[PDB]
Design an enzyme around this catalytic site. Structure first.
Site, mmCIF file in Angstrom:
data_model
loop_
_atom_site.group_PDB
_atom_site.id
_atom_site.type_symbol
_atom_site.label_atom_id
_atom_site.label_comp_id
_atom_site.label_asym_id
_atom_site.label_seq_id
_atom_site.Cartn_x
_atom_site.Cartn_y
_atom_site.Cartn_z
ATOM 1 N N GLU F 1 0.841 -1.220 0.000
ATOM 2 C CA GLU F 1 0.000 0.000 0.000
ATOM 3 C C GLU F 1 0.865 1.254 0.000
ATOM 4 O O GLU F 1 0.600 2.187 0.756
ATOM 5 C CB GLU F 1 -0.998 0.005 1.152
ATOM 6 C CG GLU F 1 -1.910 -1.205 1.183
ATOM 7 C CD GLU F 1 -3.339 -0.834 1.505
ATOM 8 O OE1 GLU F 1 -3.555 0.252 2.085
ATOM 9 O OE2 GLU F 1 -4.245 -1.624 1.173
ATOM 10 N N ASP F 2 1.893 1.271 -0.823
ATOM 11 C CA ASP F 2 2.813 2.397 -1.009
ATOM 12 C C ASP F 2 3.699 2.647 0.202
ATOM 13 O O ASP F 2 4.398 3.646 0.224
ATOM 14 C CB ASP F 2 2.111 3.708 -1.393
ATOM 15 C CG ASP F 2 1.423 3.624 -2.733
ATOM 16 O OD1 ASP F 2 2.098 3.266 -3.724
ATOM 17 O OD2 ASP F 2 0.213 3.919 -2.803
ATOM 18 N N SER F 3 3.709 1.767 1.197
ATOM 19 C CA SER F 3 4.712 1.880 2.242
ATOM 20 C C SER F 3 6.084 1.475 1.705
ATOM 21 O O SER F 3 6.210 0.862 0.645
ATOM 22 C CB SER F 3 4.348 1.015 3.446
ATOM 23 O OG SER F 3 3.227 1.518 4.132
#
Ligand SMILES: [Mg+2]
Ligand SMILES: [Zn+2]
Ligand SMILES: [Zn+2]
Ligand SMILES: [Zn+2]
Lengths: 48, 61, 49, 263, 57, 147, 67, 45, 113, 56
Positions: F1-3
């Site tokens: 999740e774009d981490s």
RNA sequence: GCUUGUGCUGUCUUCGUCCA
């Protein structure tokens, strides 16, 4: 009122030995001392 | 000291001032302003003297 | 001289491009604080329309 | 049963081969040398004057990363384990740097060789900043122009890389096993042919390539491990290897002591 | 946008300054971890705690 | 999740470490012919309506000095304004209030080191101060990065 | 601003090789050859010296604030 | 009682809360406070 | 602001034991050991040493969360042997292996220098 | 610190101070007055400390 | 004999953040 409020202090024991600080809160033995470099305040007993 | 006394002391030391970088830059800027005033007034004699003075003061390192 | 001085200073300071009493129903945002977070942002703000 | 073979040896790097050991043992040795071998590094900085163009914490961070000689750091004590008041000679080393530019022109460079040891443990070889040669100047710390001075007092303490990476004795540990992929531990991505699209390992000539008619051996395990240990100069490579082994042994002995005391 | 944008969770006290979510609840919240922020509301009564734990969980 | 995962050892060695500066401004306002605000260290006796922060880090001139540690709410600029005294002229030898506190505290969420203190005069002619605070921000969980 | 002491990725000391790098570039060596001469093999360490910008030289051109 | 420094010629002087805020020698209108005397310590991390 | 002290990864609190052993009653002769202030370095070593013992029928470990420095081990042995004795034997065996490895390394270093 | 004061001329008048004879045994002299001398700028304490005041 | 103090503006404008 304790005679140690707003006074430069040094820690002599524990995990923060030899760090310069200033006493901000002192109720019962657990002096609250802000650390000059780490932007934080930590509890500490008066014995240290 | 009062404001007038401080200004008098500053003027006295400026007269004593042999050279100072900030003051040299300020003097060069004032000379440039005087030079543009002379150029805009079509005074061909004053501008030569100001250019010679700037050449003498200038040539920094 | 305070007329021209104050009018220019107010219009450039607030961005409202008109008389101060005529601030209502006047164009706004014509003047903005320069962006200085990074050099590229300053260049972009200086070349904006 | 375990065997050691050394390929190349130097003060700051050793290239060895481990055989007849488990993969877990070699990996734990690598991790121990990376994160758990104690060294000496500057930890407290008292700044008496700093008129340079660099911030105080900038210079403090740079000072923390300077490698110091840590040969006898095993005889030193941890600061939190020392009963002394403030810092003493048995748990700390004091260094002092004083720099200034004389003249009205030019720039003066502040190097790590300007750090002077003032106090420390008696007859222990600890504290001095590491230097490659006698004429080497060391690490560039700061730059000063006219009327700019730096005057600091540093305190070097013992620690490990788990607390901060400045205490790490190693830089990078190369680690590799099975250059010909006989154990099939990796599945090679390819476009046309995996064999000619992947470069050969640097230890590919140390092992016999598999025969074309050979069948997969499912009973085999990784047996030979190649590793190179590079140090920052604070310790020699053999010292790092021996102290990693000793640290692992001490951890295991502590576990055994806790087990026996549990009864 | 819908009632699954507000759900009742159980608190776990943890270090660092972010809120932490299981990744399967990011779909009803329509959330991702590229800078989003979320709000938290603490009930102040036994009845309100029971309502949260028995209806909105 | 774009981490993303960052290397803690790289962070320890100085990757993406940054410096942060914040400046505060204050000046003495003119209210009348003789009514002027003053930069000074307030005292609980002469001054009324003090704040909950500390005042021991101020100097004689009411300004903090560069190189001092400051925490949230601490007072960095001490300023007082005069107030017409109450009926305390019934007798209060040295403890009758004539001033109201108008000091500038540090932001409650910030802390750092005082980096530079500026003192000058404004266009009108009253005093004028600027205090700059410096701190270092180290990357941590929840910080935003982009390619 | 000024050359980092350690490589960010692995921690090799690269802070003692800036002046030698500038010397080698002065002599006419290519940047890759100069990095090879300084024994910087891993590209993580080569990135540290190849992409560094020396901003302290610009900061030092302003007159000192205390004398 | 309190030390200052000029913003132009870097000259040191003192003020008594009654003088105009000015440099003594070059008359600059911008002055800076001097660094404190308290102990300053950092953790080198 | 909410960052824990870095020394908490390896410094053991006074009131926190280094080692806590509880039985796992679901299967016979199984114990659950909780290691404090340890990580994969000791866990993987102990696990893969124990997995080669004939009298050890089950051995595993897990680090529940990377932000907390602890791991939990599950160990199950045969009827004759007790799991704690197997753990002690594993520790002693790894210590002996490290000892001979250090000896041979020192010998080879002295030879090559 | 105080030579540029306008009142310093009367302040220094009649004062007794230690003087370097040069020709050095230090002796005491009596100030009969002061006189500014233009073009006789001298270093007082440092290179930048130019001074024109002279003491008779 | 000596005792620790107890809080905060309003109204616009602009620039941004995450969705949409
Ligand atoms: Mg998002
Ligand atoms: Zn000690
Ligand atoms: Zn590297
Ligand atoms: Zn000046």
């Amino acid at each position: 009122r304790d005679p140690t409020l707003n006074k430069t202090v040094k820690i002599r024991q524990g995990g923060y030995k030899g760090k310069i600080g200033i006493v901000k809160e002192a109720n019962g033995d657990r002096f609250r001392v802000e650390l000059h470099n780490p932007n934080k305040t930590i509890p500490i007993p008066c014995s240290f | 000291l009062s404001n007038d006394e401080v200004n008098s002391i500053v003027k006295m030391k400026q007269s004593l001032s042999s050279n100072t970088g900030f003051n040299t830059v300020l003097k060069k800027a004032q000379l440039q302003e005087e030079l543009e005033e002379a150029r805009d007034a079509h005074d061909h004699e004053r501008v030569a003297r100001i250019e010679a003075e700037l050449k003498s003061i200038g040539a920094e390192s | 001289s305070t007329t021209i001085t104050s009018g220019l200073k107010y219009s450039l300071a607030t961005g409202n491009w008109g008389e101060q009493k005529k601030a209502m129903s006047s164009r706004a945002g014509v003047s903005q604080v320069l962006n200085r977070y990074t050099y590229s942002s300053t260049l972009s703000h200086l070349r904006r329309t | 049963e375990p065997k050691v073979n050394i390929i190349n040896a130097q003060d700051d790097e050793v290239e060895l081969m481990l055989s007849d050991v488990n993969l877990s043992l070699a990996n734990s040795l690598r991790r121990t040398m990376l994160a758990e071998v104690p060294t000496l590094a500057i930890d407290l900085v008292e700044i008496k004057m700093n008129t340079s163009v660099l911030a105080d914490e900038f210079i403090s961070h740079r000072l923390g990363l300077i490698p110091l000689v840590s040969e006898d750091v095993e005889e030193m004590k941890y600061s939190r384990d020392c009963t002394c008041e403030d810092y003493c000679d048995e748990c700390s080393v004091v260094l002092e740097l004083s720099a200034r530019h004389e003249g009205e022109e030019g720039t003066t460079d502040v190097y790590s060789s300007s750090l002077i040891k003032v106090s420390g443990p008696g007859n222990l070889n600890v504290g001095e900043p590491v230097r490659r040669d006698d004429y080497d100047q060391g690490i560039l710390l700061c730059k000063l122009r006219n009327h700019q001075e730096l005057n600091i007092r540093c305190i070097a303490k013992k620690g490990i890389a788990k607390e901060h990476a400045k205490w790490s004795p190693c830089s990078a540990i190369a680690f590799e096993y099975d250059p010909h992929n006989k154990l099939k531990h990796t599945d090679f991505w390819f476009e046309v042919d995996a064999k000619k699209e992947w470069p050969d390992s640097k230890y590919a000539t140390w092992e016999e390539p598999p025969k074309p008619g050979e069948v997969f051996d499912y009973k085999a395990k990784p047996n030979r491990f190649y590793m190179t240990v590079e140090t920052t100069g604070s310790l020699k490579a053999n010292q790092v290897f021996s102290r990693g082994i000793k640290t692992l042994q001490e951890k295991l002995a502590n576990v055994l002591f806790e087990l026996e005391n549990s009864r | 946008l819908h009632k699954m944008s507000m759900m009742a969770h159980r608190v776990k006290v943890m270090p660092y300054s972010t809120f932490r979510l299981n990744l399967s609840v990011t779909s009803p919240y329509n959330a991702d971890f590229d800078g989003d922020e979320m709000n938290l509301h603490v009930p102040q009564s036994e009845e309100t705690r029971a309502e949260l734990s028995q209806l909105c969980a | 999740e774009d981490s993303m995962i960052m290397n803690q050892s790289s962070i320890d060695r100085g990757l993406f470490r940054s410096l942060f500066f914040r400046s505060y401004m204050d000046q003495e306002k003119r209210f009348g012919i003789s009514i002027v605000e003053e930069f000074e260290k307030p005292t609980r006796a002469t001054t009324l309506r003090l704040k909950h922060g500390t005042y021991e880090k101020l100097d004689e001139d009411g300004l903090i000095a560069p190189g001092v540690r400051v925490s949230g709410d601490d007072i960095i600029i001490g300023k007082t304004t005069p107030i017409p005294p109450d009926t305390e002229e019934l007798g209060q030898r040295t403890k009758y209030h004539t001033k109201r506190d108008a000091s500038t505290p540090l932001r409650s969420t910030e802390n750092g080191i005082v980096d530079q203190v500026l003192l000058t005069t404004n266009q009108e002619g009253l005093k004028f101060v600027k205090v700059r605070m410096r701190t270092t921000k180290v990357p941590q969980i929840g910080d935003k990065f982009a390619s | 601003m000024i050359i980092p002491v350690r490589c960010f990725s692995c921690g090799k000391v690269v802070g003692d090789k800036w002046d030698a790098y500038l010397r080698l570039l002065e002599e006419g060596k290519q940047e890759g050859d100069a990095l090879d001469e300084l024994k910087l093999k891993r590209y993580c360490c080569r990135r540290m010296v190849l992409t560094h910008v020396d901003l302290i030289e610009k900061f030092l051109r302003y007159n000192p604030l205390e004398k | 009682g309190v030390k200052y420094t000029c913003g132009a010629c870097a000259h040191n002087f003192s003020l008594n809360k009654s003088d105009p805020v000015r440099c003594k020698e070059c008359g600059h209108r911008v002055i800076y406070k001097a660094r404190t005397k308290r102990m300053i310590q950092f953790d080198a991390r | 602001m909410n960052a824990p002290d870095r020394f908490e990864l390896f410094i053991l609190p006074d009131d926190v034991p280094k080692l806590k052993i509880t039985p796992d009653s679901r299967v016979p002769n199984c114990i659950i050991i909780k290691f404090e202030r340890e990580d994969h370095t000791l866990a993987n070593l102990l696990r893969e040493e124990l997995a080669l013992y004939p009298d050890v029928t089950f051995v595993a470990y897990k680090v529940e969360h990377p932000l907390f420095a602890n791991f939990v081990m599950r160990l199950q042995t045969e009827e004759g042997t007790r799991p704690k004795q197997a753990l002690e034997r594993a520790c002693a065996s790894i210590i002996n292996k490290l000892k001979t490895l250090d000896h041979k390394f020192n010998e080879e270093w002295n030879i090559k220098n | 610190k105080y030579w540029y004061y306008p009142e310093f001329d009367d302040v220094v008048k009649g004062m007794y101070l230690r003087l370097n004879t040069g020709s050095s045994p230090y002796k005491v002299v009596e100030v009969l007055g002061s006189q500014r001398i233009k073009g006789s700028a001298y270093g007082l304490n440092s290179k930048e400390n130019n001074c024109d005041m002279y003491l008779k």
